[PDB]
Amino acid sequence: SVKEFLAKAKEDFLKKWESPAQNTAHLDQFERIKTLGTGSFGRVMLVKHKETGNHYAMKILDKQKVVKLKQIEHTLNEKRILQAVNFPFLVKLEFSFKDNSNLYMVMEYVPGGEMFSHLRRIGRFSEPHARFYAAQIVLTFEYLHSLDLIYRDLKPENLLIDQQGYIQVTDFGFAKRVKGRTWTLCGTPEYLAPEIILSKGYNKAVDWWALGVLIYEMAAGYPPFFADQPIQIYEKIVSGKVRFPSHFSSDLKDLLRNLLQVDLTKRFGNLKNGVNDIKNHKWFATTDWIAIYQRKVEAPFIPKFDTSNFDDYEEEEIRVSINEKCGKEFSEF
């Protein structure tokens, strides 16, 4: 059963969580090819593992930038959690290591690019197309939450499309293992649940609110709350007054009203029946949850095959200092 599968999933996770993989490669083992994406601490590059010819995506984090942004514990969470998880729609952490200047996380290379890129270019996804992706996120969150993990940064920028058109979730920078509630103000403005904005303390329900935002954005082509400045976005979120495009199906609107619910005792994913309120919802009536997990469903879109599915970014030399930086802070990495 699902409860049985998850219980076993947890046994596997806890072993790796209690005894994390560390120092499993070195920089010179990889040929660096091209930047695939960037972020506050650094960049992610396509690399080739010299000994095997395998391609990977190497995330490079400048330790000093991490410290300046007060993200040490978050970065330790990111690596400890990612090395411990295992799910079909989660990007794999293949190796990790550090040097005097940087932290490195060598992850699975996902060649189809960011959902963000395709969504912006095409404008919006059909409901069946959006549903296909949404189903994968639902299953992924079911898995993560069962391990007491909150993800906290769902958005199209963080969802990569693989060669078969399935999603791979990336960027565990705000992922956290927590029983009960937590308080950090983190995420992306458009995707924040009201309780985060209002400093109320919050739990895994914030991921379900975020799913509502994602589904809305996939199906509309724009998110339910936007404005040129984050402050104005926050004002719209806390009002929770959502308007739906006229092309939204009745079922879709109903699901979204239950996900984008300000009231925590009414928000789908967070009720007595948990994730099953979502899985059994009418909008997902056509969804075969087992077939999705087994990747037996034909994707509504497979990317054209090479890095042309990613934007070009400015490159910079990866300079390593002759002095160790922030050693104590990142001891466990």
Partner: peptide, 19 residues
Amino acid sequence: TTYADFIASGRTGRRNAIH
């Protein structure tokens, strides 16, 4: 249209996380 308002907005590119 809301779509037009979005496309003319400053929030159509990659969105930074809040740190």
